Nucleic acid binder design. Structure first.
Ligand SMILES: [Mg+2]
Ligand SMILES: [Mg+2]
Ligand SMILES: [Mg+2]
Ligand SMILES: [Mg+2]
Ligand SMILES: [Mg+2]
Ligand SMILES: [Mg+2]
Ligand SMILES: [Mg+2]
Ligand SMILES: [Mg+2]
Ligand SMILES: [Mg+2]
Ligand SMILES: [Mg+2]
Ligand SMILES: [Mg+2]
Ligand SMILES: [Mg+2]
Ligand SMILES: [Mg+2]
Ligand SMILES: [Mg+2]
Ligand SMILES: [Mg+2]
Ligand SMILES: [Mg+2]
Ligand SMILES: [Mg+2]
Ligand SMILES: [Mg+2]
Ligand SMILES: [Mg+2]
Ligand SMILES: [Mg+2]
Ligand SMILES: [Mg+2]
Ligand SMILES: [Mg+2]
Ligand SMILES: [Mg+2]
Ligand SMILES: [Mg+2]
Ligand SMILES: [Mg+2]
Ligand SMILES: [Mg+2]
Ligand SMILES: [Mg+2]
Ligand SMILES: [Mg+2]
Ligand SMILES: [Mg+2]
Ligand SMILES: [Mg+2]
Ligand SMILES: [Mg+2]
Ligand SMILES: [Mg+2]
Ligand SMILES: [Mg+2]
Ligand SMILES: [Mg+2]
Ligand SMILES: [Mg+2]
Ligand SMILES: [Mg+2]
Ligand SMILES: [Mg+2]
Ligand SMILES: [Mg+2]
Ligand SMILES: [Mg+2]
Ligand SMILES: [Mg+2]
Ligand SMILES: [Mg+2]
Ligand SMILES: [Mg+2]
Lengths: 121, 169, 213, 159, 294, 58
RNA sequence: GGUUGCGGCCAUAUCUACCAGAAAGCACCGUUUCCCGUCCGAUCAACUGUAGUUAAGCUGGUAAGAGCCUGACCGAGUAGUGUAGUGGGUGACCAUACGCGAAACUCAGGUGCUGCAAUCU
RNA sequence: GAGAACAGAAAUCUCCAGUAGAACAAAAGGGUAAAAGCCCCCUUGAUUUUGAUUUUCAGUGUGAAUACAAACCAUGAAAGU
RNA sequence: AAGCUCGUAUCAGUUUUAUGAGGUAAAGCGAAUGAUUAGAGGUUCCGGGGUCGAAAUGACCUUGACCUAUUCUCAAACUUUAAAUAUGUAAGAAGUCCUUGUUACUUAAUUGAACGUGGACAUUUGAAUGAAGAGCUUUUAGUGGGCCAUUUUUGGUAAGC
């Protein structure tokens, strides 16, 4: 949390939904295998890499995220950073580098992060 | 109340402030010796003062401390000279008192023209018993209020014995 | 002599008062700070009005003087030598400097001699205070108003909720006095605590714990 | 000229604490220092001898040596782009055991104890420190607590 | 006394250590007795603590802890009755005596009391108790005078001689023993010996009684009441070492009443202090006494 | 002519290219400046404690 | 619980004034041949514990007591401040967003705790 | 502050209060009260051998300093220094 | 640039937890030091200028100085208090525990001190997050005029100084 704080003018974050996570992991899920950014298109790949912590599917990956839980760390790290586009629809505000509370983007916008991500997804 | 605390002469210190060094000061001391039976102590100038003619660390004045029955006796001889009358001055707030005489031959003492004539200060300090409390090394302490000498107290002392007079105020 | 106030209106330098390191400053142009009926009891003048700075600057001594006079005078002609108490609540403790160019020397060794004094004055900070009888409100406000014109910057004028120079809301002041908790003194006034030693607390303020009324 | 003597800028660093001047209490001389002890360095300007240079004021390090009246302490110090090793001869009056290490040892003693009473049950331990977590759901009640509702306050000068 | 202490003064006034105020501890000198060569770690410095009251003599062996000084063993002059000394309970000879008892007693309980005999002979000569080769080293102890003046011939250096001769190692030198003639810069062990056995006291008795039947009979009232002849004094002290080295062990006093018993009387003379409740009640009454202008 | 006198500008950038590291670390560290008698005796406590171990192999 | 010796932390312990103190202890106190120190056996030294006294020291109790300590949604979430903006404003300067956050003030409680050894109605 | 013949503003002699308001060669800052200040007694550690360390630093020199080792000493009842 | 030794490790321009250092901002001045406005009461029985009997070793006087409790206002080279931001250290296998070996050091002492033998303890083995690998050697180029912006800030009336 104290990290987020430190970094808040440069990021835009909030509380994701099964929906947003489902679609983020499906459409933009890539795994980390010996560096290499490998796309999760078949369940075998996760099980070959995340099987040791349970998790032999993609919805096994998703679950372990949305619930946090025991091997979240190793699950989430496995997940290469998501490369979102720019928001199709727009940022919904004139300037982004103020806070969400002040008229847009940057800082915790809470359960608004979904509408945002989904347009960048 | 009044048991211990009987109030007494702690010490008597005779001073002759000569104000110059040499024979005159050796002579003044001899008087104090020839009187106290003690060997007296010389005082050095705290600082040079030119109108008085004294230099710093020059031997100027001599005094001797007397305690016990002798000092009680040399007190009387003085008191004798002041005709058993002192002033409501002389008595300090803290309980001690003093006076001064011109001419020391006025209390006993032959003349001896090789010694001449000196006058002298007479300060007598008063205490009670239990004063070692302020004087000892270990567990030094302060007297209690309802103890300890004062000027009301050690004036009435002075009248009671000595059958004396303290004047003015 | 004397360059414009414009060259020293901002708090640009750490306070530089006269000191053992800064001996040889000249004397403040304002010397009197209390005038009118300065010996008047606390009871006489219940109404208090303040001339308040709304900026953050420096006020010269000479401003303080000039404004002080322009205040005192107008007060006295219109209600009299004894109808008010005027207190200059700001002292010119800080020393201004001149570099002072006399071919020529240059920017070398530019440390300046002392040039005059000022008062580093704050947002909200009281400048002048006046106390009078309620029937001199309007003569007082215009004293100060006339004075404003002698001071750089926006300075406000405010009616104090205080019985005179004391603290205490006027209502809370009258509770205390009619309770005897208040004792006169050198123009100001002392208050009865419930803290010190009982004895000399009753010898100082008899009227409080007494039959009386 | 500029002036960079040994104790420069240390007017307030080596002052004593308000109403704590004079003799240094005996406790100081009774604490015992072994090698590998982690000490805090904080000068006392009444003890002029064995003084730490002002750099090391506020710095913690490990004892590498013990002598009649002083410990030797190892300090890692950055000069340029690298830490260098630094050996300090400090009299004990300027030195203190580092409490943070005692939190640690005491915790290690705890963690061996917890670990026992689990093998003595063959159950699981969970020994690593967890950091302060979110918060779980609650139900606050209104019994004796009907929410007082507040509103913003008017402007009002008090001067 | 209208030298009133300005509230300023009081506020930034810095009190001395409690025992400084009391005039008991010389903390400058304590710090040097107590401090150990840090590379001897918890090797305790041991102190020979010798204090005199007006009627008694205290001899403790102390070491210092951060949480407090701790005593290994203590001996007194008021124990000495048990060992045959009935009078002169604060003189030099009782000091040597008390210095011996503590010695024997500590290093009895320590275990080195069979080894390290001490002197037994006692002609009052200057010698430390050197250690026996191929064996232990003696219980070393450093004298703690506290606040006593270092005068040559002081009572406190009796207990020292008592303890050394007892077979404690207590570093010292002659020049503060009676017998030390500073012209000579030598010690006459006859004088020191005498003192161990109360010589200086006995003589005076003889000189007194002959010269002053009346003074003597007052100063020495109790040597009469017990027929302690003067020139029998030595044999009291000599005999007293015997019994001391004999049974050095400590035995307490037989104490009537238990701790609690004492207590529950032994200061229900304590003044019990008010409750703020009552205190306020006093406040509000005091006024009515004082209220009304007088 | 006059020139800039001093600045630390850019110096931590420079120091942090390939720098800081930590300090290098070893069990059995240097015995530089340790109490010479103790070293002397340590020398002997080691020879002995060696010896005694080779005696335990025969 | 008293008291003493050695202490720890070094004012909740210090300061001022008034009382109170069984028993033991401590103390004041008596003495000056002796080791010893003084202008002065006052301090220091030695001697008796005998002639005396709780007066003092010391211990507690009191006090809308001075000081000192502790608390508090007491003031004040104020002052100051890290981060943000193509925020306001001629400027001086100020408001807002995410954070950290005092001093004085006011009131309330308190006024040594404690270790080792010895000893006591 | 209260008191003592000549003695005065200022000579010398008591007493009381006194956290340092004094002193410590020097500029200033720090430090200090049964002392680090004042008076006294005894002294030559201001010595011998070469190493390690801290500051300035390139982690060179120089200066100055700190803690041990190995001698020889000074002082003190001593711990110690 | 050349590589070399290794291969998940010990890493880090980071947070967290625990525990240190600091005297700036603010604050303060009926707290020390130094400044500064105003009265008020008291002092002198030990500075004084007079009026009342020239009288004055005598009164009441205004006037200093000093004292007591108040009052307005200040500090880069004052301060009790005292932040924010920065800043040291620690968070384990080089560890923890039990047994008892060495020595000329040290202890009254097989007491300690250091360094060991032997035995036991590996799921989270002792917070977070990251790791695009970590470690290491040799050697050489250029450079050694800088400047700008926010903020902090010194000199100057200021300056695109
Ligand atoms: Mg898109
Ligand atoms: Mg659309
Ligand atoms: Mg479109
Ligand atoms: Mg919108
Ligand atoms: Mg003359
Ligand atoms: Mg012009
Ligand atoms: Mg400037
Ligand atoms: Mg110049
Ligand atoms: Mg110049
Ligand atoms: Mg400089
Ligand atoms: Mg500074
Ligand atoms: Mg002090
Ligand atoms: Mg030195
Ligand atoms: Mg006050
Ligand atoms: Mg001493
Ligand atoms: Mg002789
Ligand atoms: Mg040039
Ligand atoms: Mg240029
Ligand atoms: Mg250059
Ligand atoms: Mg240059
Ligand atoms: Mg004598
Ligand atoms: Mg006597
Ligand atoms: Mg004596
Ligand atoms: Mg006493
Ligand atoms: Mg109080
Ligand atoms: Mg920007
Ligand atoms: Mg702006
Ligand atoms: Mg504009
Ligand atoms: Mg602001
Ligand atoms: Mg001098
Ligand atoms: Mg100095
Ligand atoms: Mg002198
Ligand atoms: Mg030399
Ligand atoms: Mg400020
Ligand atoms: Mg403050
Ligand atoms: Mg002030
Ligand atoms: Mg400046
Ligand atoms: Mg860091
Ligand atoms: Mg990790
Ligand atoms: Mg290169
Ligand atoms: Mg190069
Ligand atoms: Mg080059």
């Amino acid at each position: 949390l104290e990290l987020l704080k430190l970094i808040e003018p440069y990021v835009a974050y909030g509380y994701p939904s099964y929906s947003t996570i489902r679609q983020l992991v499906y459409k933009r899920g890539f795994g980390k295998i010996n560096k290499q950014r490998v796309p999760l298109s078949d369940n075998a790949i996760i099980e070959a890499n995340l099987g040791k912590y349970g998790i032999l599917s993609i919805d096994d990956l998703i679950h372990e995220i949305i619930t946090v839980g025991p091997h979240f760390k190793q699950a989430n790290n496995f997940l290469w950073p998501f490369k979102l586009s720019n928001p199709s629809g727009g940022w919904g505000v004139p300037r982004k580098f103020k806070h969400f509370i002040q008229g847009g983007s940057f800082g915790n916008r809470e359960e608004f992060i979904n509408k945002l991500v989904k347009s960048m997804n | 109340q009044n048991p211990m605390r009987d109030l007494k002469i702690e010490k008597l210190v005779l001073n002759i402030s000569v104000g110059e060094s040499g024979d005159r000061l050796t002579r003044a001391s001899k008087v104090l010796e020839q009187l106290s039976g003690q060997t007296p102590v010389q005082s050095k100038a705290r600082y040079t003062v030119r109108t008085f003619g004294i230099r710093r660390n020059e031997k100027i004045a001599v005094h001797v401390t007397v305690r016990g029955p002798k000092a009680e006796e040399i007190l009387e001889r003085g008191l004798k000279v002041k005709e058993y009358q002192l002033r409501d001055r002389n008595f300090s707030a803290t309980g001690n008192f003093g006076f001064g005489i011109d001419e020391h031959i006025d209390l006993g003492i032959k003349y001896d023209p090789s010694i001449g004539i000196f006058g002298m200060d007479f300060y007598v300090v008063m205490n009670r018993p239990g004063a070692r409390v302020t004087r000892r090394k270990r567990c030094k302490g302060t007297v209690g209020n309802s103890h300890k000498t004062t000027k009301e107290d050690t004036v009435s002392w002075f009248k009671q014995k000595y059958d004396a007079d303290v004047l003015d105020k | 002599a004397r360059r414009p106030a414009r060259c020293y209106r901002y708090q640009k330098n750490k306070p530089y008062p006269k000191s053992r390191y800064n001996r040889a400053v000249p004397d403040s142009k304002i010397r009197i700070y209390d005038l009118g009926k300065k010996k008047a009891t606390v009871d006489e003048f219940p109404l208090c009005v303040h001339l308040v700075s709304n900026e953050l600057e420096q006020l010269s001594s000479e401003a303080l003087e000039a404004a002080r006079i322009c205040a005192n005078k107008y007060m006295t002609t219109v209600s009299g030598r004894d109808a008010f108490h005027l207190r200059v609540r700001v002292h010119p403790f800080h020393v201004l400097r001149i570099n002072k160019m006399l071919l020529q020397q240059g920017m070398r060794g530019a440390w300046g001699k002392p040039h005059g004094l000022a008062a580093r004055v704050d947002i909200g900070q009281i400048i002048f205070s006046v106390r009078t009888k309620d029937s001199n409100k309007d003569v007082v406000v215009e004293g100060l108003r006339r004075a404003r014109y002698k001071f750089p910057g926006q300075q406000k004028i405010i009616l104090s909720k205080k019985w005179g120079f004391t603290n205490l809301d006027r209502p809370e002041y009258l509770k205390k006095r009619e309770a005897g908790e208040v004792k006169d003194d050198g123009a100001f006034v002392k208050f009865l605590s419930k803290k010190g030693s009982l004895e000399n607390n009753i010898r100082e303020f008899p009227e409080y714990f007494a039959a009386q009324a | 000229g500029k002036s960079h003597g040994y104790r420069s800028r240390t007017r307030y660093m080596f002052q004593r604490d308000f109403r704590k001047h004079g003799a240094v209490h005996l406790s100081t001389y009774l604490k015992v220092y072994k090698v590998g002890d982690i000490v805090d360095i904080k000068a006392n300007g009444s003890i002029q001898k064995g003084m730490p240079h002002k750099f090391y004021q506020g710095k913690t390090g490990v004892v590498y040596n013990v002598t009649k009246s002083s410990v030797g302490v190892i300090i890692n110090k950055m000069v340029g782009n690298r830490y260098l090793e630094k050996r300090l001869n400090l009299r004990v009056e300027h030195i203190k055991h580092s409490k943070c290490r005692q939190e640690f040892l005491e915790r290690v003693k705890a963690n061996a104890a917890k670990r026992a009473e689990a093998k003595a049950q063959g159950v699981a331990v969970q020994l690593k420190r967890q950091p302060a977590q979110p918060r779980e759901s609650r139900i606050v009640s209104t019994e004796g607590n009907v929410p007082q509702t507040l509103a913003p306050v008017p402007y009002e000068t008090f001067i | 006394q209208k030298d009133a202490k300005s509230s300023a003064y009081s506020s930034r006034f810095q009190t001395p250590f409690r025992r400084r105020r009391e005039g008991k501890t010389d903390y400058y000198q304590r710090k040097r007795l107590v401090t150990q060569h840090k590379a001897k770690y918890n090797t305790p410095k041991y102190r020979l603590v010798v204090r005199f009251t007006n009627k008694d003599i205290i001899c403790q062996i102390i070491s210092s802890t951060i949480t407090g000084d701790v005593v290994l063993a203590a001996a007194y002059s008021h124990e000495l009755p048990r060992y045959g000394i009935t009078h002169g309970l604060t003189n030099w000879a009782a000091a040597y005596a008390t210095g011996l008892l503590i010695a024997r007693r500590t290093l009895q309980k320590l275990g080195l009391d069979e080894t390290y005999k001490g002197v037994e002979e006692v002609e009052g000569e200057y010698e430390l108790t050197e250690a026996v080769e191929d064996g232990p080293r003696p219980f070393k102890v450093f004298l703690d005078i506290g606040l006593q003046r270092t005068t040559t011939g002081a009572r406190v250096f009796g207990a020292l001689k008592g303890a050394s001769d007892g077979g404690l190692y207590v570093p010292h030198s002659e020049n503060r023993f009676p017998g030390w003639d500073f012209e000579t810069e030598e010690i006459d062990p006859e004088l020191l010996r005498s003192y161990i056995f109360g010589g200086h006291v006995s003589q005076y008795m003889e000189e007194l009684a002959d010269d002053d039947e009346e003074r003597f009979s007052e100063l020495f009232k109790g040597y009469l009441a017990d027929d302690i002849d003067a020139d029998s004094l030595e044999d009291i002290y000599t005999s007293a070492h015997e019994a001391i080295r004999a049974d050095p062990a400590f035995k307490p006093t037989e104490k009537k009443f238990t701790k609690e018993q004492y207590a529950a009387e032994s200061k229900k003379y304590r003044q019990t202090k008010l409750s703020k409740e009552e205190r306020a009640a006093r406040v509000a009454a005091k006024i009515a006494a004082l209220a009304g202008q007088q | 002519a006059k020139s800039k006198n001093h600045t630390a500008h850019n110096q931590t950038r420079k120091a942090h290219r390939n720098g800081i590291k930590k300090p290098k670390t070893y069990k059995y560290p240097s015995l530089k400046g340790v109490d010479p008698k103790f070293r002397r005796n340590h020398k002997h406590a080691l020879h002995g404690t060696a010896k005694a171990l080779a005696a335990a192999k025969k």
